[PDB]
Amino acid sequence: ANRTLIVTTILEEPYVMYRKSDKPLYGNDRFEGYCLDLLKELSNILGFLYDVKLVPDGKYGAQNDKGEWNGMVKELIDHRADLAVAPLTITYVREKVIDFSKPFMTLGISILYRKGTPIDSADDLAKQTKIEYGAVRDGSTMTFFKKSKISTYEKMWAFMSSRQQSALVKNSDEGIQRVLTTDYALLMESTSIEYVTQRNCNLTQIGGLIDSKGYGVGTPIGSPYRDKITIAILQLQEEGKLHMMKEKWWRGNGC
Amino acid sequence: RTLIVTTILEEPYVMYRKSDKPLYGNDRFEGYCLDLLKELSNILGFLYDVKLVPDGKYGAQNDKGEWNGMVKELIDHRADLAVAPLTITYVREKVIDFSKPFMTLGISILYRKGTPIDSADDLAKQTKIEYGAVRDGSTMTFFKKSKISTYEKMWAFMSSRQQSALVKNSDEGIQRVLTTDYALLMESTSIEYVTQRNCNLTQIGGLIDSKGYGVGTPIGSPYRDKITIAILQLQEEGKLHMMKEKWWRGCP
Ligand SMILES: CCC[C@@H]1CN[C@H](C(=O)O)[C@H]1c1cccc(C(=O)O)c1
Ligand SMILES: CCC[C@@H]1CN[C@H](C(=O)O)[C@H]1c1cccc(C(=O)O)c1
Ligand SMILES: [Cl-]
Ligand SMILES: [Cl-]
Ligand SMILES: [Cl-]
Ligand SMILES: [Cl-]
Numbered sequence: 001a002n003r004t005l006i007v008t009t010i011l012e013e014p015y016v017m018y019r020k021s022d023k024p025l026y027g028n029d030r031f032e033g034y035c036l037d038l039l040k041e042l043s044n045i046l047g048f049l050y051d052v053k054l055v056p057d058g059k060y061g062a063q064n065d066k067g068e069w070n071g072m073v074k075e076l077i078d079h080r081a082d083l084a085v086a087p088l089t090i091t092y093v094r095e096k097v098i099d100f101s102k103p104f105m106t107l108g109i110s111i112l113y114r115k116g117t118p119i120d121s122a123d124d125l126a127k128q129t130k131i132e133y134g135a136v137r138d139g140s141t142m143t144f145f146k147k148s149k150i151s152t153y154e155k156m157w158a159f160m161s162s163r164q165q166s167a168l169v170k171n172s173d174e175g176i177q178r179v180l181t182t183d184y185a186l187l188m189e190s191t192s193i194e195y196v197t198q199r200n201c202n203l204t205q206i207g208g209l210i211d212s213k214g215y216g217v218g219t220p221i222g223s224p225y226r227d228k229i230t231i232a233i234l235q236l237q238e239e240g241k242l243h244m245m246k247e248k249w250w251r252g253n254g255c
Numbered sequence: 256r257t258l259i260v261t262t263i264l265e266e267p268y269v270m271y272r273k274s275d276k277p278l279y280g281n282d283r284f285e286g287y288c289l290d291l292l293k294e295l296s297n298i299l300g301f302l303y304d305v306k307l308v309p310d311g312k313y314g315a316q317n318d319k320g321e322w323n324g325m326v327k328e329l330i331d332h333r334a335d336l337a338v339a340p341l342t343i344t345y346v347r348e349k350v351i352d353f354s355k356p357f358m359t360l361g362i363s364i365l366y367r368k369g370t371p372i373d374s375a376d377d378l379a380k381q382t383k384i385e386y387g388a389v390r391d392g393s394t395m396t397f398f399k400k401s402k403i404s405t406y407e408k409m410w411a412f413m414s415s416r417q418q419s420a421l422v423k424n425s426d427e428g429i430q431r432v433l434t435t436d437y438a439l440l441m442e443s444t445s446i447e448y449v450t451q452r453n454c455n456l457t458q459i460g461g462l463i464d465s466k467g468y469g470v471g472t473p474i475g476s477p478y479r480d481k482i483t484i485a486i487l488q489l490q491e492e493g494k495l496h497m498m499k500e501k502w503w504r505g506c507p
Contacts, residue, residue: 103467148493150493214355231348234345242465
C-alpha cells in the first residue's frame, strides 16, 4: 500500500490559490494554479498520490540567529512534508539544509517601475536620488544587494538601507502597491514582475535580469523522491509543458 | 587524493593555452570551464587532474544503448567530475548525477543580419531559406518530439530530403550560415559566442526552450551536492556572470 505524500505549499498567486466555488470544497480540490498543475503532471509521470497542506506559518523559509528555520523549509527539515511544491527560490543557504530538485523555473532580479521614465537600468537608478527604489526587506533580492561587491549595487544597497530602510517594503504585494501609487521602483524576482506587467499596462520591467536563480521543488535531505522529481521536471521541460503552464497562468488580457 | 576531471576541447570553455614553450598538466588548458574548476577547487579544497575525454564526445547512446563521451567516463568511474558545457537532459540525468546549472540557456536561431526573418515561425512559413540543426544533438531532439504545430512543420522540413538541412556539428553549421542561405537552430551560448565575433551574423528571436549546463558526477557521488552548493555560492557572488563576460566578450 503506497503512502500518500504530504506536499507543503503556500498561498501565492498564481502558483497556489483557493478556487472560486458556490459549494464547499475539500482536499486538493480546494486549490488551483501553476503549482497544482505541476503537481498533477509530476504525479502522472511518477505515480504518487498526494495531500496538499498549506504551511502553517505562511512562510517560505528563513533561519533566525539561532540557526532555526521556519516556513516550508522547516516542514521539510522536520519531515512533516515530503515535497515543497511552491515557487521556492534555490539559494545557497536553503540548499544546504534541504535537497532541491532541478529548477522548474529560471528567473532573476529585475526592476518593476512606471513606463516613460529616464530610468533604463539599475545604474540609472543608482546615480540619482529623486526616484525612490528598494526591495522587499529580508528577501532574496535584498540579500543580493546586501552582499554584492559590485560598485553600482553597493551604492544602491547604501541608498536602500539609509533613513531607517524607508525604501524597503514589507513584502511583494505592498511593494507593488507602492509602485502603483508613488514614485517608487521595486527590485524583485522577475516572475513576480512579469505577472504584474501582464495586468498593469502602465508598468514595465526595466533592464534585464541582474542575477540568475531558479525555483525548485524542495525535499528533505536524503529524500528518495528528489532525483525522480528532477527527472520528471526535465521530461516536462523537454516536452514544452512547463513553458505552456507558465503561459497559461501568467498571460493577462493584453495591453 | 586528486580528482580526475573529464572535459572536452571546446571554445571558449576549454582550449589549449598558447605558448612559446611546452606546457604540462592543468597549465595546458584555459577557458571558462578551467576558471570554473579553479573556483570550485578553491571552495571545496580538492586537487585535480584534467583529462580530455578520449573520443571527444559529450555523451549519447548508440543503437545498442551503450553510452559514449564524458557521460561514459563518469558511468565507468574513470573520472570523478565532468566540467564542461554538458547539457542537462532527461536521458543523461538518468545515468549520471548533475549539479545544479552553472549556465542557463536555450535553443535559438543563428542567421545573417538585416533580413525579414524575425522568428522560427517566419522560417516555418517558407522553404527558400534552408534551416536546420545539428544532427542528433539537443536542438534536434526538441524539434523531433515537439507537438507545437510550427515546430512540427520545421522538423518535417529538417528531416526531408535525406536530412539535407541538418549539419554534422556546430562548427560546420556556423560555416554553412556564413557561406550559403542557411539558418541554424542551436544552443544560445554558441550563438552568443559567434555573434560577438562575426558581425555578419545575429540571433533571430529569443529562446524557444530552456536548459542548463551542469557539472557531471557518477550516480551516488558525494561531490554532486557539494559542487551544487559551490555553484550556488559563485552564482550569488556574481562570479559565474563575471566569468561568462570574460570569455564571451569580443560588433554593433
Ligand atoms: C510572489 C513570489 C514570492 C517569492 C517566491 N520565491 C521567493 C522565496 O522563495 O523566498 C519569494 C520572495 C519572498 C520575499 C522577497 C522576494 C523578492 O522577490 O525579493 C521573493
Ligand atoms: C559548442 C558547444 C556544444 C554544445 C554544448 N552542450 C551540448 C551538449 O552537451 O551536448 C553541445 C551540443 C552538441 C550537439 C548539438 C548541439 C546543439 O546546439 O544543438 C549542442
Ligand atoms: Cl491546508
Ligand atoms: Cl540537482
Ligand atoms: Cl588530456
Ligand atoms: Cl552527445
